[PDB]
Design a protein around this ligand. Sequence first.
Ligand code: 4AA
Ligand code: 4AA
Ligand code: FE2
Ligand code: FE2
Ligand code: FE2
Ligand code: FE2
Lengths: 174, 174
Amino acid sequence: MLTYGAPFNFPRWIDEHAHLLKPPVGNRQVWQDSDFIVTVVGGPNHRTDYHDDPLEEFFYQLRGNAYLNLWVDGRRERADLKEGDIFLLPPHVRHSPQRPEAGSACLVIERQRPAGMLDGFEWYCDACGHLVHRVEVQLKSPVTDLPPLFESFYASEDKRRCPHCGQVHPGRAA
Amino acid sequence: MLTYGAPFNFPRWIDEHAHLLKPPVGNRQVWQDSDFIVTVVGGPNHRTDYHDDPLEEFFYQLRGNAYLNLWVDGRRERADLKEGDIFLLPPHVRHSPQRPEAGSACLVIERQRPAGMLDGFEWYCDACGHLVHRVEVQLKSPVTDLPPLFESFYASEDKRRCPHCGQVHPGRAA
Ligand SMILES: Nc1c(C(=O)O)ccc(Cl)c1O
Ligand SMILES: Nc1c(C(=O)O)ccc(Cl)c1O
Ligand SMILES: [Fe+2]
Ligand SMILES: [Fe+2]
Ligand SMILES: [Fe+2]
Ligand SMILES: [Fe+2]
């Protein structure tokens, strides 16, 4: 059977979900219970967490512009997702997507992580670049599993305290 | 490291590879040696083989129109990929892509099959619908591994002979 339904027009789908491609929801998954996790991400949104995904991530920035804050070769780097760009992110490259534009829309495709293969979410100290806090999670429902993880970091000065230089990470916003 | 390089503009990439998105090549893989197999498929092309992929396949028909001949619920069915359509194909649904239009361009995303997980390629009898021939293959390099498989079917009346009604499949073209 066509478990995920028939083909459908993607631009019209994006238009119809515009109200979800903005705060507070920000993103909408296309199909449920599939191996390919297909998500459309809107804006605006800024975040301070870096994602450590054990599998690849595919990006196609369909509308508007965004960028990824990365750690590459031990140094902070930025990868621009200009309108029309595609990009394949290798496993475990730490990335923090920044989406300044309202009305933007990025297709993101990932794989369902099998049991035992964990995702990481990390924050780094603005002062000395040291890792401040990492949580590993079996990511089965990101829409609901991630908000409490992030909220628990923002709420704890202990979690936000840099072990190297002592600076307390600002938490939700840079 | 950014093993697969920096982001780049997808429409211009498609334009620059137009000469490969037509016979005889037909399609071009975007990145090499990745877990996500990202391919752009042009046209025109018609084919008689059905693919039995043990993992999912994602389609985004960016330019032009195409369609998939399917077996769904034991019956022949057609799924149209009109310009702008996206579609997620579940594992093992037999599908035969037909791409009548020159200048068409479809983004296809699949997963590298791990060792021991085999792909099937099948032909069915136009007269009685029975399976005529199936080859299973460890698909590591489709660009080169598939042509000899297909050619060996076209070349053999034995392979093309329906075991149920005796009709010899036409081979390369319906
Ligand atoms: N990369 C993302 C993004 C992003 O790039 O902002 C948002 C949601 C999901 Cl599920 C993602 O995989
Ligand atoms: N679905 C396809 C097609 C297709 O849909 O015609 C062509 C090449 C590759 Cl590698 C595919 O996975
Ligand atoms: Fe990610
Ligand atoms: Fe620090
Ligand atoms: Fe296929
Ligand atoms: Fe037959």
